[PDB]
């Protein structure tokens, strides 16, 4: 770690501080995560081990790269590639002018490519929020912060005492589903797609029930017809107020019919019918950015 010069503190988590650092001889910039092993009762934190291993397996242009892992004395350094801004700061900086629709489309397409790759590796991210999406100055966006990611070779269960996002939490989780699915990541991306378009969080709840009602007021109170089984879920109440699904022309005015089509499929109540990441890439909203390949068989 002697060839790195710390330049600025850019973050802090339960397990360490994150610094922007420069390689003195090459001039390259990296993001350093410093874990002080002296204060760790259980050795390398389980979340750090899992993230290091996952990132070594997940190499993709839309997934933040882990460049190295350096064990100095008493300290474990995670060396990540550096990106100048997260999507939250970019959207806030663009609240007045708005983000050009072609950049919105390109960002969402890239997010879906990185997500499809994660899902192909049988890994749920579970924490896709604008703060965990990083952008560079070349028009690229990548998925980051895999601390909450879990592999689903076997069902991933929901735990009452786990801290996960609320504004980007899927309704099946809020209604007490026993397991997570790839759909929760698609839901998060749908909220983010709408936030990029309107520059306001789509569902900014302040409690679990507030978050749920906010979703209901926008997409309508679900019933057995739109989501088979809702009435049987643990936290479902027949007492839930009946709200009508709002028209997407008012929810996301700047979006065209193709964009509104994709968002509705990414926000489908039924986790079983919510669009997959690979399917979203095939949606007509992205016909100008991609063209299929000839299929064999």
């Amino acid at each position: 770690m002697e060839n790195f010069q710390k330049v600025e503190k850019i973050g802090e988590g339960t397990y360490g501080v994150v610094y922007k650092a420069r390689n003195k001889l090459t001039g390259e910039v990296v993001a350093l995560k410093k874990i002080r092993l002296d204060t760790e009762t259980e050795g390398v934190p389980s979340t750090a081990i899992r993230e290091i291993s996952l990132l070594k397996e997940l190499n993709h242009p839309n997934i933040v790269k882990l460049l190295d892992v350096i064990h100095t004395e008493n300290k474990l350094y995670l060396v990540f590639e550096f990106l100048h801004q997260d999507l939250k700061k970019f959207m806030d900086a663009s609240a007045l002018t708005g983000i050009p629709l072609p950049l919105i489309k390109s960002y969402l397409f890239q997010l879906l490519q990185g997500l499809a790759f994660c899902h192909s590796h049988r890994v749920l991210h579970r924490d896709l929020k604008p703060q965990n999406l990083l952008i560079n100055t070349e028009g690229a966006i990548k998925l980051a912060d895999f601390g909450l990611a879990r592999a689903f070779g076997v069902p991933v269960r929901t735990y009452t005492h786990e801290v996960v996002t609320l504004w980007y939490r899927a309704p099946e989780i809020l209604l007490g589903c026993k397991y997570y699915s790839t759909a929760v990541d698609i839901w998060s991306l749908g909220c983010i797609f709408a936030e990029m378009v309107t520059r306001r969080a789509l569902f900014p709840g302040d409690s679990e029930i507030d978050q749920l009602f906010r979703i209901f007021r926008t997409l309508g109170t679900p019933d057995e017809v739109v989501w088979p089984g809702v009435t049987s879920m643990p936290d479902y109440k027949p007492s839930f107020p009946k709200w009508a699904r709002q028209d997407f022309s008012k929810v996301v005015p700047p979006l065209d019919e193709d964009g509104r089509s994709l968002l509705s499929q990414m926000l489908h109540y039924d986790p079983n019918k919510r669009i997959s990441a690979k399917a979203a890439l095939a949606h007509p909203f992205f016909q100008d950015v991609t063209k299929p390949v000839p299929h064999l068989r």
Partner: protein, 270 residues
């Protein structure tokens, strides 16, 4: 590296079956095995590994750890030793327990605490030593801690069958794999082949090929090697699916169990 292997995965809504299968196949190309690694440690003998692995299995049951945690520890141990030289018997317990510690931290939601890992060593390993060894193992493995274990392959195969009492069949095949893994010669065979051969011994070539994609020719040699082991298991009757307090019935098949398999291993090798 099996040109005759087909893809048994059903159509998946969440991803492209071809890419999912390809990633699974590529794991066997990143995570190597060396059935002769003990030749790098002349003072070690194969029985020592069997004893160590059987003990870790019993540790896993006591704390009700998952089968995947045990197989992650077995793969970590075998891969780590392949990178080392001249290790002696008195260090195996620490290497093994630290391998389980890493595994439990990766796989369990609420892993046992470090002091519990030291506790089961009964004064032989301290917590500071486990902390030291875990870092040694992880760095020597270049932090590649995500293999497709033998038992994870069983879950893939049994999931292909279900999506086309499954829990009791799983633990019975798992019991046979638990016995085979104690013999270092099982590493001659890809983890996927071992799982398919154990499943074949409790089923048919037709089901094996349908759920694993392997043709008979790819598993025949493993099948022949596994013969003595399948036979000592069949002769005693297979175990029964057990219940675990605090573990949902739907996940009970994934909890590691332990029986006196060292006497079975002797009969099989005889």
């Amino acid at each position: 590296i099996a040109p005759s292997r087909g893809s048994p995965l059903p159509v998946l809504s969440w991803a492209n079956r071809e890419e999912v299968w390809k990633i699974m196949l590529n794991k066997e190309k990143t995570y190597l095995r060396d059935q002769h690694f003990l030749e790098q440690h002349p003072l070690l003998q194969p029985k020592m590994r069997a004893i160590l692995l059987d003990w870790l299995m019993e540790v896993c049951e006591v704390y009700k750890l998952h089968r995947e945690t045990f197989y992650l520890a077995q793969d970590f141990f075998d891969r780590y030793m392949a990178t080392q030289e001249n290790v002696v018997k008195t260090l195996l317990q620490l290497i093994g327990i630290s391998s389980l510690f890493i595994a439990a931290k990766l796989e369990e939601i609420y892993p046992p605490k470090l002091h519990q890992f030291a506790y089961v060593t009964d004064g032989a390993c301290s917590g500071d030593e486990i902390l030291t060894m875990e870092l040694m193992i992880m760095k020597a493995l270049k932090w590649r801690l995500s293999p497709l274990t033998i038992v994870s392959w069983l879950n893939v195969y049994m999931q292909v069958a279900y999506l086309n009492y499954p829990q009791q069949i799983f633990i019975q095949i798992a019991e046979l794999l638990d016995l085979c893994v104690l013999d270092v010669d099982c590493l001659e065979f890809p983890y996927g082949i071992l799982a398919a051969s154990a499943l074949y011994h409790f089923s048919s070539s037709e089901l094996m090929q349908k759920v694993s994609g392997y043709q008979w020719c790819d598993i025949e040699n493993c099948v022949k090697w596994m013969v003595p082991f399948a036979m000592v298991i069949r002769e005693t009757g297979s175990s029964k699916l057990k219940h675990f307090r605090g573990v949902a019935d739907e996940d009970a098949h994934n909890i590691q169990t332990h029986r006196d398999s060292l006497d079975l291993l002797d009969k099989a090798r005889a």
